[PDB]
């Protein structure tokens, strides 16, 4: 009888809808699709972004980010792949991972939880690779769970916490920078040629602390290049950003005459141009919603430290360009800050940055997404976003803090037989 060995190249629809929801400052998966080696991928996403109804009207916009990444299966399975592909049919099946038994767990991966509490390993591990290479601070430790059921709630139902927009206290120098370095000398002598060699060792250490925490950064400084296969990192295909706006509604009865309520609704588009898929893998699409980091109790540095010295106030170029970094506390920038929490800044940074001012009359007032109290804990706890800081800004609904409805217009050019060829023997 007739045996088919090849196919022709045709476009495939693969379009679907998007009823999404999430929290603020957490990275959640929006869409996912498998691809084959040799394909071409295209996507237009058109939708609307809404926030929960506000308590008093629109005051500050929020910014929204959409990302698309490509993750090969060889980056996840490694050597179990390759052997799988070389053996062809009759190869051993690929492994899975375990999840907690609920419906809303494994929702940060953009799927409903199966009744068996098992999902493909490449879905979970492909999310960890994106977070560890692009979204955590380079000086933080990596995250390695091996099983989605080892996470807690708010990590399984919603994504992982991300970082605030850069600021004086949300973007400090890494907690490993050295404020001094010693050189061993004799009792009544010093080698001045070895002193010259001690400055060259410190220069390489300071570069590896401010710019070059990752291997791909070290190679780039020499003038070289690394492919994402050499580093085993995902490939960023597209990125979009916008601000979300809306309007107000006026109350008209006896009690609410003079009261307003804000309604955020924004139309957006995420477009990915045609992309050649070199190996089997997955495409991820993710979203992130954030606010500018405004706090009600922040003060200017020169107004908070006690007595002004020449180094603070003069702005002398010979002094700012030759001094080590300065270590300060949370008490120097916040009214109720803790004096035992320290971080390091650059000298003269108070003449390069200006903070926002919030009047004392705004303290503890509903609506108005601010940070009411100075953040507590170690450095990593302060830099990451706490979505409980925005609970008093919205009204309680079932759809969390933001929701979206989107149509994904995907198109892939594959080499597959038609449905007719698959069901007919001859």
């Amino acid at each position: 009888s007739n045996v088919q060995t090849g196919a022709e190249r045709m476009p495939h629809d693969l379009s679907h809808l998007g009823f999404l929801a999430g929290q603020i400052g957490r990275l959640i998966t929006i869409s996912t699709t498998p691809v084959i080696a040799g394909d071409s991928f295209e996507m237009d996403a058109v939708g609307a972004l809404r926030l929960s109804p506000l308590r008093r009207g629109l005051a500050i916009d929020s910014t929204v980010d959409i990302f698309t990444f490509y993750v090969p299966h060889r980056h996840v399975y490694g050597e179990q792949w390759i052997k799988f592909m070389k053996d062809g049919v009759n190869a051993a099946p690929l492994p899975t991972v375990n999840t907690t038994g609920y419906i809303d767990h494994a929702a940060f991966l953009g799927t409903i939880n199966p009744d068996t509490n098992k999902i493909p390993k490449h879905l979970f591990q492909g999310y960890l690779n994106i977070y560890n290479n692009y979204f955590k601070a380079p000086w933080m430790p990596d995250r390695t769970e091996a099983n989605p059921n080892q996470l807690n709630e708010d990590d399984a139902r919603y994504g992982f916490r991300c970082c605030h927009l850069k600021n004086i206290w949300t973007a400090p120098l890494p907690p490993e920078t050295e404020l001094s370095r010693q050189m061993t000398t004799s009792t009544t002598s010093i080698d001045i040629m070895g002193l010259q060699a001690a400055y060259a060792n410190l220069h390489t250490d300071q570069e590896r602390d401010y710019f070059m925490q990752r291997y791909r950064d070290v190679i780039s400084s020499f003038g070289g290049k690394t492919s994402y296969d050499a580093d085993n990192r995902p490939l960023l295909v597209m990125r979009s950003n916008f601000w979300a706006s809306g309007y107000d509604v006026d109350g008209t009865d006896q009690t609410s005459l003079g009261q307003f309520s804000g309604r955020v609704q924004q139309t957006y588009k995420h477009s990915v141009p045609r992309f050649f898929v070199p190996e089997h893998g997955t495409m991820f699409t993710l979203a992130l919603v954030r606010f500018p980091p405004t706090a009600t109790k922040e003060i200017q540095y020169l107004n908070a430290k006690g007595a002004l010295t020449y180094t603070d106030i003069a702005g002398d170029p010979a002094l700012y360009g030759n001094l080590p970094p300065r270590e300060i506390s949370m008490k120097d920038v916040f009214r109720s800050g803790d004096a035992s929490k320290k971080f390091k800044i650059a000298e003269g940074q108070w003449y390069r940055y200006a903070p926002s001012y919030v009047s004392p009359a705004y303290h503890l007032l509903e609506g108005f997404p601010f940070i009411q109290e100075p953040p507590s804990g170690d450095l990593q706890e302060r830099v990451l976003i706490r979505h409980h800081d925005y609970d008093q800004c919205f009204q309680s609904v079932q759809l969390l803090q933001w929701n979206s409805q989107v149509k994904f217009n995907v198109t892939v050019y594959r080499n597959l037989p038609t449905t007719r060829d698959s069901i007919m023997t001859s």
């Binding site: 679907h16 609307a48 950003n241």
Partner: protein, 37 residues
Amino acid sequence: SKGKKRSGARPGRPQPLRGTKGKRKGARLWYVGGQQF
């Protein structure tokens, strides 16, 4: 990072979603034994 850094805001109103699929049609997908409306 690599290659995107684009933008996506549009003006107007968020019209309701119309049709679950369809941007460009390929070949037939479903065979029931005749026409079905």
